[PDB]
Write an enzyme that holds these catalytic residues in place. Sequence first.
Site, PDB file in Angstrom:
ATOM      1  N   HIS A  51      34.976  28.423  30.941  1.00  0.00           N
ATOM      2  CA  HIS A  51      33.759  29.240  30.834  1.00  0.00           C
ATOM      3  C   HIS A  51      34.013  30.644  30.330  1.00  0.00           C
ATOM      4  O   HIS A  51      35.114  31.177  30.412  1.00  0.00           O
ATOM      5  CB  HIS A  51      32.986  29.328  32.256  1.00  0.00           C
ATOM      6  CG  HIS A  51      33.532  30.317  33.232  1.00  0.00           C
ATOM      7  ND1 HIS A  51      32.834  31.302  33.890  1.00  0.00           N
ATOM      8  CD2 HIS A  51      34.875  30.450  33.606  1.00  0.00           C
ATOM      9  CE1 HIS A  51      33.745  32.003  34.642  1.00  0.00           C
ATOM     10  NE2 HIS A  51      34.964  31.475  34.453  1.00  0.00           N
ATOM     11  N   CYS A 102      35.849  37.068  33.786  1.00  0.00           N
ATOM     12  CA  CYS A 102      36.425  36.216  34.857  1.00  0.00           C
ATOM     13  C   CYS A 102      37.941  36.115  34.686  1.00  0.00           C
ATOM     14  O   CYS A 102      38.352  35.803  33.570  1.00  0.00           O
ATOM     15  CB  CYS A 102      35.848  34.778  34.802  1.00  0.00           C
ATOM     16  SG  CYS A 102      36.529  33.699  36.094  1.00  0.00           S
ATOM     17  N   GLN A 116      28.960  28.541  42.712  1.00  0.00           N
ATOM     18  CA  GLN A 116      27.545  28.963  42.889  1.00  0.00           C
ATOM     19  C   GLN A 116      26.673  27.888  42.255  1.00  0.00           C
ATOM     20  O   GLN A 116      26.885  27.419  41.134  1.00  0.00           O
ATOM     21  CB  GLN A 116      27.268  30.326  42.193  1.00  0.00           C
ATOM     22  CG  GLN A 116      27.880  31.455  43.025  1.00  0.00           C
ATOM     23  CD  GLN A 116      27.984  32.728  42.255  1.00  0.00           C
ATOM     24  OE1 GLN A 116      26.970  33.372  42.011  1.00  0.00           O
ATOM     25  NE2 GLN A 116      29.155  33.140  41.800  1.00  0.00           N
ATOM     26  N   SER A 160      27.306  36.441  39.939  1.00  0.00           N
ATOM     27  CA  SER A 160      28.476  37.049  39.229  1.00  0.00           C
ATOM     28  C   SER A 160      28.128  37.571  37.835  1.00  0.00           C
ATOM     29  O   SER A 160      28.715  38.533  37.333  1.00  0.00           O
ATOM     30  CB  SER A 160      29.612  36.030  39.078  1.00  0.00           C
ATOM     31  OG  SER A 160      30.007  35.588  40.370  1.00  0.00           O
ATOM     32  N   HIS A 190      26.859  33.261  32.150  1.00  0.00           N
ATOM     33  CA  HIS A 190      27.865  32.291  31.747  1.00  0.00           C
ATOM     34  C   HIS A 190      27.508  31.395  30.564  1.00  0.00           C
ATOM     35  O   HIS A 190      26.337  31.186  30.233  1.00  0.00           O
ATOM     36  CB  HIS A 190      28.181  31.329  32.887  1.00  0.00           C
ATOM     37  CG  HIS A 190      28.498  31.924  34.185  1.00  0.00           C
ATOM     38  ND1 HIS A 190      29.718  31.807  34.780  1.00  0.00           N
ATOM     39  CD2 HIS A 190      27.651  32.612  35.065  1.00  0.00           C
ATOM     40  CE1 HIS A 190      29.637  32.421  36.009  1.00  0.00           C
ATOM     41  NE2 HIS A 190      28.373  32.906  36.157  1.00  0.00           N
TER      42      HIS A 190
HETATM   43  O1  LIG Z   1      34.917  32.270  40.848  1.00  0.00           O
HETATM   44  C1  LIG Z   1      35.737  32.528  39.955  1.00  0.00           C
HETATM   45  N1  LIG Z   1      35.574  33.650  39.251  1.00  0.00           N
HETATM   46  C2  LIG Z   1      34.341  34.459  39.458  1.00  0.00           C
HETATM   47  C3  LIG Z   1      34.624  35.992  39.397  1.00  0.00           C
HETATM   48  O2  LIG Z   1      33.341  36.602  39.714  1.00  0.00           O
HETATM   49  P1  LIG Z   1      33.212  37.683  40.886  1.00  0.00           P
HETATM   50  O3  LIG Z   1      33.499  36.938  42.203  1.00  0.00           O
HETATM   51  O4  LIG Z   1      34.197  38.747  40.731  1.00  0.00           O
HETATM   52  O5  LIG Z   1      31.746  37.986  40.913  1.00  0.00           O
HETATM   53  C4  LIG Z   1      33.247  34.044  38.431  1.00  0.00           C
HETATM   54  C5  LIG Z   1      32.732  32.655  38.519  1.00  0.00           C
HETATM   55  C6  LIG Z   1      31.461  32.421  39.038  1.00  0.00           C
HETATM   56  C7  LIG Z   1      30.943  31.126  39.054  1.00  0.00           C
HETATM   57  C8  LIG Z   1      31.681  30.048  38.556  1.00  0.00           C
HETATM   58  C9  LIG Z   1      32.956  30.280  38.046  1.00  0.00           C
HETATM   59  C10 LIG Z   1      33.473  31.574  38.029  1.00  0.00           C
HETATM   60  C11 LIG Z   1      36.854  31.716  39.786  1.00  0.00           C
HETATM   61  C12 LIG Z   1      37.913  32.249  39.010  1.00  0.00           C
HETATM   62  C13 LIG Z   1      38.922  31.277  38.801  1.00  0.00           C
HETATM   63  C14 LIG Z   1      40.117  31.402  38.083  1.00  0.00           C
HETATM   64  C15 LIG Z   1      41.022  30.322  37.981  1.00  0.00           C
HETATM   65  C16 LIG Z   1      40.732  29.101  38.576  1.00  0.00           C
HETATM   66  C17 LIG Z   1      39.534  28.968  39.300  1.00  0.00           C
HETATM   67  C18 LIG Z   1      38.614  30.028  39.424  1.00  0.00           C
HETATM   68  S1  LIG Z   1      37.099  30.125  40.251  1.00  0.00           S
END
Ligand SMILES: O=C(N[C@@H](COP(=O)([O-])[O-])Cc1ccccc1)c1cc2ccccc2s1
EC number: 5.2.1.8
Length: 113
Positions: A9, A63, A81, A104, A107
């Site tokens: 993503h 991300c 989410q 977040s 996407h």
């Molecule tokens: O959760 C993540 N990174 C979030 C950051 O956002 P923040 O918490 O700082 O608001 C964004 C996000 C949101 C929804 C789906 C996927 C990603 C995830 C980051 C990673 C990296 C490697 C493997 C698995 C994952 S899982």
Amino acid sequence: EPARVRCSHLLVKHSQSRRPSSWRQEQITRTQEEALELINGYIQKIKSGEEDFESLASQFSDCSSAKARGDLGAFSRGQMQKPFEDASFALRTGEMSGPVFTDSGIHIILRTE
Ligand SMILES: O=C(N[C@@H](COP(=O)([O-])[O-])Cc1ccccc1)c1cc2ccccc2s1
């Protein structure tokens, strides 16, 4: 529906995001409007062939999965989410989503497995 889908993503955060900061930018200052305008710029360029999804991901995704060229790895329901989750399991292998909103940020999702 499989038990799990694997997806990559590109995430464009904005100043109203749940955690407005990222590995690439100490403070996310861009507005919601600018973020969706960027996401749509990337979408039309990926569709034209001008840019590659994983390269744009590795470069501009707010991300940390950016280092893994956008790859999040595999995931079942009840982990991510719900907007992200629904859009991902709705994708065919190799299909790209259009704008997807979560707390977040905005996407663009690519289902790989
Ligand atoms: O959760 C993540 N990174 C979030 C950051 O956002 P923040 O918490 O700082 O608001 C964004 C996000 C949101 C929804 C789906 C996927 C990603 C995830 C980051 C990673 C990296 C490697 C493997 C698995 C994952 S899982």
